[PDB]
Design a protein around this ligand. Structure first.
Ligand SMILES: Cc1ccc(OCC(=O)N2CC[NH+](C)CC2)cc1
Length: 119
């Protein structure tokens, strides 16, 4: 029933993701000196520090908005990878499975709490 519970649930999930070795390439923006053509392929860079900062600033209204930004991290990895067998893309696939496994109840609980609020 708690309409606000998603925020701490997302903070905790972000903490687990930061602790995970698979999040290393995604903890800060992609290095434009290392990948000089990055912005010719990727329109909207996104990373987990930006997600965490947006959440802490009180700039997400729902866990759906947070989930859209996290999914953008993974779609940017899929778009920039030169191959399906690349190291960073392989890490993003595992991290995405972990994120999706944990975010499902956060989204369901929030949507259920909002429906209860409007019963
Ligand atoms: C965001 C992104 C996504 C996929 C990439 O695929 C190539 C890769 O994973 N590497 C080749 C270059 N090494 C220095 C690191 C390993 C690279 C960057």
């Amino acid at each position: 029933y708690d309409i606000q519970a998603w925020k701490k649930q997302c903070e905790e999930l972000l903490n687990l993701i930061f602790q995970c070795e698979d999040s290393e390439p995604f903890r800060q923006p992609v290095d434009l000196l290392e990948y000089p053509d990055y912005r010719d392929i990727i329109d909207t860079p996104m990373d987990f520090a930006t997600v965490r900062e947006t959440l802490e600033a009180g700039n997400y209204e729902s866990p759906m908005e947070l989930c859209k930004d996290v999914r953008l991290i993974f779609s940017n990895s899929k778009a920039y990878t030169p191959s399906k067998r690349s190291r960073i893309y392989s890490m993003s696939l595992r991290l995405s499975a972990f994120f999706e496994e944990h975010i499902s109840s956060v989204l369901s609980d929030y949507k259920s709490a909002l429906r209860f609020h409007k019963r």
